[PDB]
Tab-separated table of N, CA, C and O and ligand atoms in Angstrom:
chain	number	residue	atom	x	y	z
A	1	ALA	N	75.668	119.940	83.467
A	1	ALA	CA	75.169	120.643	84.637
A	1	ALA	C	75.909	121.974	84.781
A	1	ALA	O	75.544	122.804	85.611
A	2	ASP	N	76.936	122.136	83.960
A	2	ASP	CA	77.730	123.352	83.984
A	2	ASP	C	78.862	123.196	85.002
A	2	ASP	O	79.983	123.640	84.761
A	3	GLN	N	78.530	122.562	86.116
A	3	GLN	CA	79.505	122.342	87.171
A	3	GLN	C	79.321	120.951	87.781
A	3	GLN	O	79.550	120.756	88.974
A	4	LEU	N	78.911	120.017	86.934
A	4	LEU	CA	78.694	118.649	87.374
A	4	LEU	C	78.026	118.662	88.751
A	4	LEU	O	78.201	117.732	89.538
A	5	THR	N	77.274	119.724	88.999
A	5	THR	CA	76.579	119.869	90.267
A	5	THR	C	75.412	118.883	90.351
A	5	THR	O	75.047	118.439	91.439
A	6	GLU	N	74.859	118.570	89.188
A	6	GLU	CA	73.742	117.644	89.117
A	6	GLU	C	74.177	116.249	89.571
A	6	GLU	O	73.647	115.716	90.544
A	7	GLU	N	75.139	115.699	88.846
A	7	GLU	CA	75.651	114.377	89.162
A	7	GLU	C	76.150	114.333	90.608
A	7	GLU	O	75.991	113.324	91.293
A	8	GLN	N	76.746	115.439	91.028
A	8	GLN	CA	77.269	115.540	92.380
A	8	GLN	C	76.123	115.579	93.392
A	8	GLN	O	76.038	114.724	94.272
A	9	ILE	N	75.269	116.580	93.233
A	9	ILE	CA	74.131	116.741	94.121
A	9	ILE	C	73.454	115.385	94.328
A	9	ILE	O	73.060	115.047	95.443
A	10	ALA	N	73.339	114.645	93.236
A	10	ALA	CA	72.716	113.333	93.282
A	10	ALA	C	73.325	112.525	94.431
A	10	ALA	O	72.613	112.094	95.336
A	11	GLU	N	74.635	112.345	94.356
A	11	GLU	CA	75.348	111.597	95.377
A	11	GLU	C	75.392	112.392	96.684
A	11	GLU	O	75.147	111.844	97.757
A	12	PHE	N	75.705	113.673	96.550
A	12	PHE	CA	75.785	114.549	97.705
A	12	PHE	C	74.507	114.469	98.543
A	12	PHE	O	74.539	114.688	99.753
A	13	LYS	N	73.413	114.155	97.865
A	13	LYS	CA	72.126	114.044	98.531
A	13	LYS	C	72.158	112.857	99.497
A	13	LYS	O	71.882	113.012	100.686
A	14	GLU	N	72.495	111.699	98.948
A	14	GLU	CA	72.565	110.486	99.746
A	14	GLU	C	73.774	110.536	100.682
A	14	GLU	O	73.716	110.035	101.804
A	15	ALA	N	74.842	111.144	100.186
A	15	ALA	CA	76.063	111.265	100.964
A	15	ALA	C	75.810	112.182	102.162
A	15	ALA	O	76.187	111.858	103.288
A	16	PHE	N	75.171	113.309	101.881
A	16	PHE	CA	74.863	114.274	102.923
A	16	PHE	C	74.476	113.571	104.226
A	16	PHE	O	74.853	114.013	105.309
A	17	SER	N	73.728	112.487	104.076
A	17	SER	CA	73.286	111.719	105.227
A	17	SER	C	74.481	111.384	106.122
A	17	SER	O	74.427	111.582	107.335
A	18	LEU	N	75.531	110.881	105.490
A	18	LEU	CA	76.736	110.516	106.214
A	18	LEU	C	77.437	111.786	106.703
A	18	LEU	O	77.624	111.973	107.904
A	19	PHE	N	77.805	112.625	105.745
A	19	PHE	CA	78.481	113.872	106.062
A	19	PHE	C	77.840	114.549	107.276
A	19	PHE	O	78.531	115.174	108.079
A	20	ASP	N	76.527	114.403	107.371
A	20	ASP	CA	75.786	114.993	108.471
A	20	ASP	C	75.739	114.003	109.638
A	20	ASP	O	74.822	113.189	109.730
A	21	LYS	N	76.739	114.106	110.499
A	21	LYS	CA	76.824	113.230	111.656
A	21	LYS	C	75.777	113.652	112.688
A	21	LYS	O	74.911	112.859	113.058
A	22	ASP	N	75.888	114.898	113.122
A	22	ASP	CA	74.960	115.434	114.104
A	22	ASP	C	73.528	115.271	113.589
A	22	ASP	O	72.658	114.783	114.309
A	23	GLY	N	73.329	115.687	112.347
A	23	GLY	CA	72.019	115.593	111.728
A	23	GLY	C	71.196	116.856	111.987
A	23	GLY	O	70.006	116.776	112.285
A	24	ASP	N	71.866	117.993	111.867
A	24	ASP	CA	71.212	119.273	112.084
A	24	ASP	C	71.209	120.069	110.778
A	24	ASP	O	70.900	121.260	110.773
A	25	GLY	N	71.554	119.379	109.701
A	25	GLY	CA	71.595	120.006	108.391
A	25	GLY	C	72.934	120.708	108.161
A	25	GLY	O	73.253	121.090	107.035
A	26	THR	N	73.682	120.857	109.244
A	26	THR	CA	74.981	121.506	109.174
A	26	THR	C	76.097	120.493	109.428
A	26	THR	O	75.954	119.600	110.261
A	27	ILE	N	77.187	120.665	108.693
A	27	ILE	CA	78.329	119.776	108.828
A	27	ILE	C	79.427	120.482	109.626
A	27	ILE	O	80.124	121.347	109.098
A	28	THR	N	79.547	120.085	110.884
A	28	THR	CA	80.549	120.669	111.760
A	28	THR	C	81.934	120.106	111.436
A	28	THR	O	82.054	118.981	110.953
A	29	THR	N	82.946	120.915	111.714
A	29	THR	CA	84.318	120.511	111.458
A	29	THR	C	84.505	119.026	111.772
A	29	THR	O	85.191	118.314	111.040
A	30	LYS	N	83.883	118.602	112.862
A	30	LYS	CA	83.972	117.214	113.283
A	30	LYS	C	83.302	116.323	112.234
A	30	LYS	O	83.896	115.354	111.765
A	31	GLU	N	82.072	116.685	111.896
A	31	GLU	CA	81.315	115.932	110.912
A	31	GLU	C	82.159	115.698	109.658
A	31	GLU	O	82.049	114.654	109.017
A	32	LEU	N	82.983	116.688	109.345
A	32	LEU	CA	83.845	116.603	108.178
A	32	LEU	C	84.949	115.576	108.439
A	32	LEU	O	85.105	114.621	107.679
A	33	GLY	N	85.686	115.808	109.515
A	33	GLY	CA	86.771	114.914	109.885
A	33	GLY	C	86.248	113.506	110.171
A	33	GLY	O	87.004	112.537	110.120
A	34	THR	N	84.957	113.437	110.466
A	34	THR	CA	84.324	112.162	110.760
A	34	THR	C	84.280	111.288	109.506
A	34	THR	O	84.736	110.145	109.525
A	35	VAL	N	83.724	111.855	108.445
A	35	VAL	CA	83.614	111.141	107.185
A	35	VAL	C	85.006	110.698	106.732
A	35	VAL	O	85.227	109.520	106.455
A	36	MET	N	85.909	111.665	106.670
A	36	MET	CA	87.274	111.389	106.254
A	36	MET	C	87.784	110.088	106.877
A	36	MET	O	88.410	109.275	106.199
A	37	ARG	N	87.497	109.932	108.161
A	37	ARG	CA	87.920	108.743	108.883
A	37	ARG	C	87.341	107.489	108.225
A	37	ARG	O	88.047	106.500	108.038
A	38	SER	N	86.061	107.572	107.893
A	38	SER	CA	85.378	106.456	107.260
A	38	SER	C	86.153	106.005	106.020
A	38	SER	O	85.975	104.883	105.547
A	39	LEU	N	86.995	106.902	105.528
A	39	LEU	CA	87.796	106.610	104.352
A	39	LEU	C	89.116	105.969	104.786
A	39	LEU	O	90.067	105.911	104.008
A	40	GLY	N	89.131	105.504	106.026
A	40	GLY	CA	90.319	104.870	106.573
A	40	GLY	C	91.242	105.902	107.223
A	40	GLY	O	91.793	105.659	108.296
A	41	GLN	N	91.383	107.032	106.545
A	41	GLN	CA	92.230	108.103	107.043
A	41	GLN	C	91.892	108.411	108.504
A	41	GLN	O	90.985	107.808	109.075
A	42	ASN	N	92.639	109.351	109.065
A	42	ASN	CA	92.429	109.747	110.447
A	42	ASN	C	92.919	111.183	110.641
A	42	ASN	O	93.872	111.424	111.380
A	43	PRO	N	92.227	112.125	109.946
A	43	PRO	CA	92.580	113.532	110.034
A	43	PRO	C	92.124	114.129	111.367
A	43	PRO	O	91.371	113.500	112.109
A	44	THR	N	92.599	115.337	111.631
A	44	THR	CA	92.249	116.028	112.861
A	44	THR	C	91.378	117.249	112.559
A	44	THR	O	91.582	117.927	111.554
A	45	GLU	N	90.427	117.491	113.448
A	45	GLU	CA	89.523	118.619	113.289
A	45	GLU	C	90.318	119.917	113.139
A	45	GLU	O	89.801	120.908	112.626
A	46	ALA	N	91.560	119.870	113.596
A	46	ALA	CA	92.431	121.030	113.519
A	46	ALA	C	92.693	121.370	112.051
A	46	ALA	O	92.358	122.461	111.593
A	47	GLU	N	93.289	120.414	111.353
A	47	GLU	CA	93.600	120.598	109.945
A	47	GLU	C	92.328	120.925	109.160
A	47	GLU	O	92.352	121.750	108.248
A	48	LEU	N	91.247	120.261	109.542
A	48	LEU	CA	89.968	120.470	108.884
A	48	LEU	C	89.429	121.853	109.255
A	48	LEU	O	88.639	122.435	108.514
A	49	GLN	N	89.878	122.339	110.403
A	49	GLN	CA	89.451	123.643	110.882
A	49	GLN	C	89.804	124.726	109.859
A	49	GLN	O	89.055	125.685	109.684
A	50	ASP	N	90.943	124.534	109.212
A	50	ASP	CA	91.403	125.482	108.212
A	50	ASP	C	90.528	125.364	106.962
A	50	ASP	O	90.277	126.356	106.279
A	51	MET	N	90.089	124.142	106.700
A	51	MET	CA	89.248	123.881	105.544
A	51	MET	C	87.849	124.470	105.740
A	51	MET	O	87.394	125.281	104.935
A	52	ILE	N	87.206	124.038	106.815
A	52	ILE	CA	85.868	124.512	107.127
A	52	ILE	C	85.834	126.038	107.018
A	52	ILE	O	84.924	126.600	106.411
A	53	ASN	N	86.837	126.665	107.614
A	53	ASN	CA	86.934	128.115	107.592
A	53	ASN	C	87.083	128.588	106.145
A	53	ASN	O	86.586	129.653	105.782
A	54	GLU	N	87.772	127.775	105.358
A	54	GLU	CA	87.994	128.098	103.959
A	54	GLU	C	86.684	127.987	103.174
A	54	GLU	O	86.225	128.964	102.585
A	55	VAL	N	86.121	126.788	103.192
A	55	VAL	CA	84.875	126.537	102.490
A	55	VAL	C	83.795	127.483	103.022
A	55	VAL	O	83.091	128.127	102.245
A	56	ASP	N	83.698	127.537	104.342
A	56	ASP	CA	82.717	128.392	104.986
A	56	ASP	C	82.706	129.758	104.296
A	56	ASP	O	83.645	130.539	104.442
A	57	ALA	N	81.634	130.004	103.558
A	57	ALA	CA	81.489	131.262	102.844
A	57	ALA	C	80.661	132.231	103.691
A	57	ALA	O	81.117	133.328	104.008
A	58	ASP	N	79.460	131.790	104.033
A	58	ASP	CA	78.564	132.604	104.837
A	58	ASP	C	79.373	133.328	105.917
A	58	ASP	O	79.069	134.469	106.263
A	59	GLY	N	80.384	132.636	106.418
A	59	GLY	CA	81.237	133.197	107.451
A	59	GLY	C	80.745	132.801	108.845
A	59	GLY	O	79.702	133.270	109.296
A	60	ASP	N	81.520	131.938	109.487
A	60	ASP	CA	81.175	131.473	110.819
A	60	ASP	C	82.204	130.434	111.272
A	60	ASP	O	82.740	130.525	112.375
A	61	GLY	N	82.447	129.468	110.398
A	61	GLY	CA	83.401	128.413	110.694
A	61	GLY	C	82.722	127.042	110.682
A	61	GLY	O	82.941	126.228	111.578
A	62	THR	N	81.912	126.827	109.656
A	62	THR	CA	81.201	125.568	109.514
A	62	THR	C	80.904	125.286	108.040
A	62	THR	O	81.027	126.174	107.197
A	63	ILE	N	80.517	124.047	107.774
A	63	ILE	CA	80.202	123.637	106.417
A	63	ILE	C	78.686	123.486	106.273
A	63	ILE	O	77.946	123.671	107.238
A	64	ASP	N	78.268	123.149	105.062
A	64	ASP	CA	76.854	122.970	104.780
A	64	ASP	C	76.692	122.277	103.425
A	64	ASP	O	77.677	122.019	102.734
A	65	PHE	N	75.442	121.997	103.086
A	65	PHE	CA	75.139	121.340	101.826
A	65	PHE	C	75.692	122.138	100.644
A	65	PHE	O	76.379	121.587	99.786
A	66	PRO	N	75.363	123.457	100.637
A	66	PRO	CA	75.818	124.336	99.574
A	66	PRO	C	77.302	124.672	99.738
A	66	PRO	O	78.016	124.844	98.753
A	67	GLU	N	77.722	124.755	100.993
A	67	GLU	CA	79.107	125.068	101.300
A	67	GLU	C	80.021	123.925	100.849
A	67	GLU	O	80.901	124.124	100.013
A	68	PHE	N	79.780	122.755	101.422
A	68	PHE	CA	80.571	121.583	101.090
A	68	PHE	C	80.622	121.368	99.576
A	68	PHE	O	81.688	121.109	99.018
A	69	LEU	N	79.458	121.483	98.953
A	69	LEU	CA	79.357	121.305	97.516
A	69	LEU	C	80.518	122.032	96.832
A	69	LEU	O	81.160	121.483	95.939
A	70	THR	N	80.750	123.258	97.280
A	70	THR	CA	81.822	124.066	96.723
A	70	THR	C	83.180	123.420	97.006
A	70	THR	O	84.017	123.309	96.112
A	71	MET	N	83.355	123.010	98.254
A	71	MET	CA	84.597	122.377	98.665
A	71	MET	C	84.970	121.234	97.720
A	71	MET	O	86.031	121.258	97.099
A	72	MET	N	84.076	120.259	97.641
A	72	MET	CA	84.298	119.108	96.781
A	72	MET	C	84.572	119.544	95.341
A	72	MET	O	85.594	119.177	94.762
A	73	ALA	N	83.644	120.322	94.805
A	73	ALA	CA	83.773	120.812	93.443
A	73	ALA	C	85.145	121.467	93.269
A	73	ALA	O	85.933	121.050	92.422
A	74	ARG	N	85.388	122.482	94.086
A	74	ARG	CA	86.651	123.199	94.034
A	74	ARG	C	87.813	122.246	94.318
A	74	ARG	O	88.957	122.533	93.962
A	75	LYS	N	87.483	121.133	94.955
A	75	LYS	CA	88.487	120.136	95.291
A	75	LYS	C	89.205	119.693	94.015
A	75	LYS	O	90.426	119.806	93.914
A	76	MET	N	88.417	119.198	93.071
A	76	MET	CA	88.963	118.737	91.806
A	76	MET	C	89.654	119.879	91.059
A	76	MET	O	90.567	119.646	90.268
A	77	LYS	N	89.191	121.090	91.335
A	77	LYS	CA	89.754	122.268	90.698
A	77	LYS	C	91.238	122.375	91.052
A	77	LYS	O	92.088	122.443	90.165
A	78	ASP	N	91.505	122.386	92.350
A	78	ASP	CA	92.873	122.482	92.831
A	78	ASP	C	93.733	121.430	92.129
A	78	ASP	O	94.699	121.766	91.446
A	79	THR	N	93.349	120.176	92.319
A	79	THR	CA	94.073	119.072	91.713
A	79	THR	C	94.143	119.250	90.194
A	79	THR	O	94.999	118.661	89.535
B	1	CA	CA1	79.492	127.693	107.792
C-alpha cells in the first residue's frame, strides 16, 4: 500500500466507528481520549490536546479520518 494505509484503512474503517464517539465524522480530543480509555488506560483530554493539535493538519484543533490516519501511521514511525 506504500504506507500500509490499505490494511490500516480496512481496520480504521470499522474502528472509525468507535473512534467517532460523537458520530459527526470528526474525532474530538475527547473522542480520542475516549478510545484510549477503552484500552484500559485513562488519559486526559489535556495530554491528548497536544496530540490533536499535532495531528490536526488542516489547522483547528481536532482529528479526523485522514488526520488520525496520519497519527497512527506516524505513530509507528516515532517508535
Ligand atoms: Ca482537525
